[PDB]
Design a protein around this ligand. Structure first.
Ligand SMILES: CCCCCCCC/C=C\CCCCCCCC(=O)OC[C@H](COP(=O)(O)OCCN)OC(=O)CCCCCCC/C=C\CCCCCCCC
Ligand SMILES: CCCCCCCCO[C@@H]1O[C@H](CO)[C@@H](O)[C@H](O)[C@H]1O
Ligand SMILES: CCCCCCCCO[C@@H]1O[C@H](CO)[C@@H](O)[C@H](O)[C@H]1O
Lengths: 112, 101, 61, 48
């Protein structure tokens, strides 16, 4: 028993949402993700390449409107958000592939 | 004796908004005075009112009500807005009167 | 599993979903009509011209 | 008075079946979509 590594019970993913609303906060945060494959899967390599195409942004990127990331360009052109990031958080048996962004109340919709 | 009180408490239960967890004042039609009154409410009272209402609408879309336990009791119904609303109407009537003179 | 197969083959891609509705309709019509007409005529045996037609159809004068 | 009589009734048969079918189907879809709000749960969490 002492030298056997314990296998953890699997965690069920659920398409769903949780909305914590507080209009008194200056900017809104939104994260959206689908279930990932987990460390061992080779696809994680492709997923990361994918996230690279979309990439990330934040009002201090100098590239501004010329950034190669389409989403980044749009965010700039239309003042869509203060920032956004893609991620591919892995775990043993599962993971989270998604993106998170920070925007002003009135631009959440376009950004999303 | 306690006639008016028997009637009121009766109508109160007959009305039925307490089954949604709403206070009498939560059910007021928001005309001009009521709108001003609401702007004067302290933050906490205002947020509580908001939740009670949001909750009611959700129960309403679900075609459910709260469990009998959670029903607002006649004597525990807090008239949180009546005080403000009366002052707003008092102020308004003053102006109306004064602008006539 | 048909549901999974159906999903993968038909309902996943919007293009195939439309193709399934069209082809689905063409087949549904053909079947549905034949069936309804079938039911209608059974519930009305010997009352329709289709039924009595033979009596005057090349069997008189 | 009404030569359409038989056709009219044959049409009623098809109308009912398609009506029965289409209504059930649309009831499910309406329910499927609303399920999100029907089962929705909320809570009031003030910094109290
Ligand atoms: C013989 C007949 C063969 C020829 C007929 C050709 C007709 C084919 C039409 C093209 C196929 C439609 C393609 C639809 C694709 C779009 C779509 O997303 O689906 C519709 C979409 C569904 O959403 P999802 O379930 O999330 O689907 C996601 C797919 N992954 O929206 C719908 O619900 C539409 C379908 C419901 C129809 C409701 C109509 C109710 C009307 C009834 C009354 C009767 C009609 C009388 C007409 C009056 C004319 C004067
Ligand atoms: C007139 O004939 C009608 O023709 C229709 C077809 O057009 C049929 O459906 C009706 O039953 C039939 O009475
Ligand atoms: C709610 C939607 C109801 C649509 C019902 C469509 C059925 C119409 O079906 C009709 O039946 C007649 C009799 O066989 C035929 O003569 C017509 O050509 C046919 O269009």
């Amino acid at each position: 028993k002492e030298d056997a590594v314990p296998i953890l019970p699997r965690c069920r993913f659920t398409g769903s949402e949780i909305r914590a609303r507080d209009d008194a906060l200056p900017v809104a945060h939104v994260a959206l993700a689908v279930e990932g494959p987990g460390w061992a899967d080779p696809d994680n390599v492709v997923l990361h390449v994918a996230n690279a195409i979309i990439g990330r942004y934040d009002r201090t990127f100098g590239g501004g409107k010329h950034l190669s990331s389409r989403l980044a360009a749009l965010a700039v052109e239309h003042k869509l958000c203060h920032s956004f990031q893609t991620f591919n958080t892995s775990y043993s048996d599962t993971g989270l592939f998604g993106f998170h962004f920070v925007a002003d109340p009135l631009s959440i919709d376009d950004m999303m | 004796g306690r006639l008016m009180d028997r009637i009121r408490k009766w109508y109160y239960n007959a009305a039925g908004f307490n089954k949604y967890g709403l206070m009498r004042d939560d059910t007021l039609y928001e005309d001009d005075d009521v709108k001003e009154a609401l702007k004067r409410l302290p933050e906490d009272l205002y947020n509580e009112r908001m939740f009670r209402i949001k909750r009611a609408l959700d129960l309403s879309l679900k075609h459910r009500i709260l469990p009998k336990e959670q029903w607002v009791k006649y004597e525990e119904d807090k008239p949180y807005l009546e005080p403000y609303l009366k002052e707003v109407i008092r102020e308004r009537l003053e102006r109306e009167a004064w602008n006539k003179k | 599993a048909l549901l999974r197969q159906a999903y993968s083959a038909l309902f996943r891609r919007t293009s195939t979903f439309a193709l399934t509705v069209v082809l689905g309709a063409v087949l549904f019509e053909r079947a549905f009509d034949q069936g309804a007409d079938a039911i209608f005529e059974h519930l009305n045996e010997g009352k329709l011209w289709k039924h009595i037609k033979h009596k005057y159809e090349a069997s008189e004068e | 008075a009404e030569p359409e009589h038989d056709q009219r009734k044959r049409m009623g048969l098809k109308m009912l079946l398609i009506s029965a079918l289409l209504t059930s189907l649309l009831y499910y879809m309406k329910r499927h979509k609303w399920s999100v709000l029907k089962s929705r749960k909320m809570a009031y969490r003030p910094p109290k």
